[PDB]
Design a protein around this ligand. Structure first.
Ligand code: IUM
Ligand SMILES: [Zn+2]
Length: 113
């Protein structure tokens, strides 16, 4: 199974500062025919359903501000929030949908320092 591993498990960043979250896939999720990374990022707020933030590893979902940026190819991916705002507090998850069963990381709890 393709296993997704996030780092760190928890991060306390100060408002206005940058938060960086890593996600590693056990095998490449970069499809050579497409040249696309089947990697997604979700933002999950307490008690709320998860919201899709970025897909194809770097494409932002409609409405998502550009301070959220996803990058990486193959096996190493990153979610960088430039200038963390109070509403950014949530657990962030990466997911691969390269091949079934689709899998997620254990999440990274992002908090205001
Ligand atoms: O808080 U919720 O998937
Ligand atoms: Zn901009």
């Amino acid at each position: 199974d393709i296993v997704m591993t996030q780092s760190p498990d928890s991060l306390a960043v100060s408002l206005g500062e940058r938060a960086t979250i890593n996600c590693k896939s056990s095998q490449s999720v970069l499809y050579s025919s497409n040249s696309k990374n089947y990697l997604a990022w979700y933002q999950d707020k307490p008690g709320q359903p998860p919201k899709l933030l970025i897909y194809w590893a770097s494409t932002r979902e409609s409405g998502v501000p550009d301070r959220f940026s996803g990058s990486g190819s193959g096996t190493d991916f990153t979610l960088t929030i430039s200038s963390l705002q109070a509403e950014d507090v949530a657990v962030y998850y990466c997911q691969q949908y390269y091949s079934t069963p689709y899998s997620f990381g254990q999440g990274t709890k992002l908090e205001i320092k």
